[PDB]
């Protein structure tokens, strides 16, 4: 049966709710959207529902809110924000035209946290082992994250931790800005058609972040960052260069001076030999020979946490809609089929 709704007007709209969900309350600011913590007295867990803005404005917007709700529907993993429960106030199609997400209330996230201070050996290893956990399961599945970095993990006290934003302007990657300084270089700069292992280079990242308490490539701009970069792991030798399919960029690349890799011993001082290890294994500038998920679980490093008994993997995820052009209405409907055809978790 259709459980009762009720209206109530939080973040400049009205919020049309099932009556389980009690006593929301608008978080984060606006930094994650339009979301508010409550408590669902069914589950008696405390949840974030975040309410789809204008979800099929576009053909681009109808397709997105499919994306999302997708991507959210498949995830099933511990170290990843999946989906408690999907619901619109709709009876019908025609009615249809709000999506509610409803996912795990995590009291911070990790930027948040981490506030300019270095983390013990033990916390980083922990932190970093969920995050690469999460990973293994996301890039199973042939999906990529693309933006990770600590703001969109989100963490609880106990430092359990959940990947936010997986597989979703130029303006706001302008400029000394985070969100730029976690992004695989290839990616930054449109060298090639990027795989799976630009996640694993934002991984390094955050993982020496956590090290030193503070940000690895802090660059004013995209070529400021571009050369703090080669200045650690080199410049790139003859094999790379002719991946860079980009002949603009490829071009540009060769007009900069030679520079060897550094000794990350000497960058990283003070730091676990093993983290040392990893983070050269990570932040290797050929994508090709970067470590995967799967391989850096079983990097010695995460010795007192790897079980490859507990590392799951996901179920086949279908992503042929993206090379597939609809009208909205059509997106519309293939996510009210969604929608309807949600089943909660045990
Ligand atoms: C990280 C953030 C910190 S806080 C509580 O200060 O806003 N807490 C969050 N816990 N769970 C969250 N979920 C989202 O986004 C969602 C993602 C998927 C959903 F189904 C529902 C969501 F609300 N954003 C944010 C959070």
Redesign the pocket.
């Given at each position: 049966e259709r459980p009762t709704f009720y209206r109530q007007e939080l973040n400049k709209t009205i919020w049309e709710v099932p009556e389980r969900y009690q006593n929301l309350s608008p978080?984060?600011s606006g930094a994650?959207?339009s979301?508010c913590?409550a408590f669902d007295t069914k589950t008696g867990l405390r949840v974030?529902?975040?309410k789809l803005s204008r979800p099929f404005q576009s053909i681009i917007h109808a397709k997105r809110t499919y994306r999302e709700l997708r991507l959210?529907k498949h995830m099933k993993h511990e170290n990843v924000?999946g989906?408690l429960d999907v619901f619109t106030p709709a009876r019908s199609l025609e009615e249809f035209n709000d999506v509610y997400?409803?996912?795990?209330?995590?009291?911070?996230?990790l930027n948040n946290i981490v506030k300019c201070q270095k983390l013990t050996d033990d916390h980083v290893q922990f932190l970093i082992y969920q995050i690469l956990r999460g990973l293994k399961y996301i890039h199973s599945a042939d999906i990529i994250h693309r933006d990770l970095k600590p703001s969109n993990l989100?963490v609880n006290e106990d430092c359990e931790l959940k990947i936010?934003d997986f597989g979703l302007t130029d303006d706001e990657m302008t400029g000394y800005v985070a969100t730029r300084w976690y992004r695989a270089p290839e990616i930054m700069l449109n060298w090639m058609h990027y795989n799976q292992t630009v996640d694993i280079w934002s991984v390094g990242c955050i993982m020496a972040e956590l090290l030193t308490g503070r940000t690895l490539f802090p660059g004013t701009d995209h070529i400021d960052q571009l050369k703090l970069i080669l200045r650690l792991v080199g410049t790139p030798g003859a094999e790379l260069l002719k991946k860079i399919s980009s002949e603009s960029a490829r071009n540009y690349i060769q007009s900069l001076t030679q520079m060897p890799k550094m000794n990350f011993a000497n960058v990283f001082i003070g730091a676990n030999p093993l983290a040392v290890d990893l983070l050269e294994k990570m932040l290797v500038l050929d994508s090709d020979k970067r470590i995967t998920a799967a391989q850096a679980l079983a990097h010695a490093y995460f010795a007192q946490y790897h079980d490859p008994d507990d590392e799951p993997v996901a179920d086949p995820y279908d992503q042929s809609f993206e090379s597939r052009d609809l009208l909205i209405d059509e997106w519309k409907s293939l996510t009210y089929d969604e929608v309807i055809s949600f089943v909660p978790p045990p």
């Open positions: 978080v984060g994650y959207g979301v913590a974030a529902v975040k959210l924000i989906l997400l409803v996912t795990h209330l995590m009291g911070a996230d989100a936010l």
